[PDB]
Structures are given as C-alpha cells and as structure tokens.
Amino acid sequence: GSDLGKKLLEAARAGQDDEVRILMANGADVNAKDRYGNTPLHLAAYMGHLEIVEVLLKYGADVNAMDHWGRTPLHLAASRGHLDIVEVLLKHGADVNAQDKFGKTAFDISIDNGNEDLAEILQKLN
DNA sequence: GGGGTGGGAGGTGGGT
Ligand SMILES: [K+]
Ligand SMILES: [K+]
Ligand SMILES: [K+]
Ligand SMILES: [Mg+2]
Ligand SMILES: [Mg+2]
C-alpha cells in the first residue's frame, strides 16, 4: 500500500513529468521526502527537469527544503549546471547563502563543478 | 557503481 507522496517521489526519480502532473492534481504531497531527505523538487532540480520544477513550485514545493546533508534544490541545480533552473529557484526565493554540511554554498558548488555562467548569476546576489 | 543524454519493470542494489 503506497501513497501519493511516495508515488510523486518515484515519478520525480524516474523523470516521469506526465505522471508528476497527474499526482499533483490528485493532491500528492509536494514536500514528501525520500530516505535521503530529497523532496521531488530536489530530484527535478538535479535532473534538469525545468518544467516540473515550475509545476512543483506552482503547487507550493518548499524552495529551501534541505536534505540530510543540508543540500537545497539550488545546490543540486548548481552542481549539474542547470542555469535556467537556478533562475527559477532564485525567482521563487531560493536562499543563496544556505551552506551544506561541508560549508559549501551553491556558489561554491557551481565553481567546483565548472559552471561559470550560473556562478556569475549567483555572484551578483552574494 | 553511478547518473538522469539509460529507463521506470526494482527501492531489501544505492545516491541525486
Ligand atoms: K535508479
Ligand atoms: K543499473
Ligand atoms: K539503476
Ligand atoms: Mg536548467
Ligand atoms: Mg553555467
């Protein structure tokens, strides 16, 4: 016996954007958390799923949700070079200063992973 | 194992 939250997480993990849209509409819990502390927003942000990122936020996903390592969606987008995703997160109130367990901000992670264009976007906001 | 340009049939295979 599963629930809408767990299904949402699975759909997010598998990149099934259509499935996500359905679950959202049937009222799935936007802030469900997997065993690592990832919300569906974490997974879409890491995966590069821009449209779903917008869907989740529309449905009120927590923009600054932190995982078990203190990583926010912003940290995950930054590690993967998803610039557009970064702008959308930022436009929705992402905190540029959140530090993960290692002290790193999104800025540092973006530098670490060679993502200079989104680095610049963040640099403006430090 | 590890990543999301591999896909969703798994989450008691594990991380994002
Ligand atoms: K997998
Ligand atoms: K595999
Ligand atoms: K796999
Ligand atoms: Mg992007
Ligand atoms: Mg970049």
The C-alpha atoms of residue A116 and residue A15 are separated, in whole angstroms, by 26
Q: How many beta carbons lie within 10 A of that of residue A1, not counting itself?
A: 3
Tell me the one-letter amino acid at A59: Y
Where are the domains positioned within chain A?
4-123
Inter-residue contact A109 to A81 (CB < 8 Å) = no
> Quick one: A4-123 is in which CATH superfamily?
Ankyrin repeat-containing domain (1.25.40.20)
Q: State in Å: Cα A49 to ligand 5 middle.
A: 16
Resolution in A: 2.0
Experimental method: X-ray
The DSSP element (H or E) to which A98 belongs, if any, is: none
Q: Distance, angstroms, CA A36 to C1' B15?
A: 8
The Å distance, CA of A96 to C1' of B7, is 33
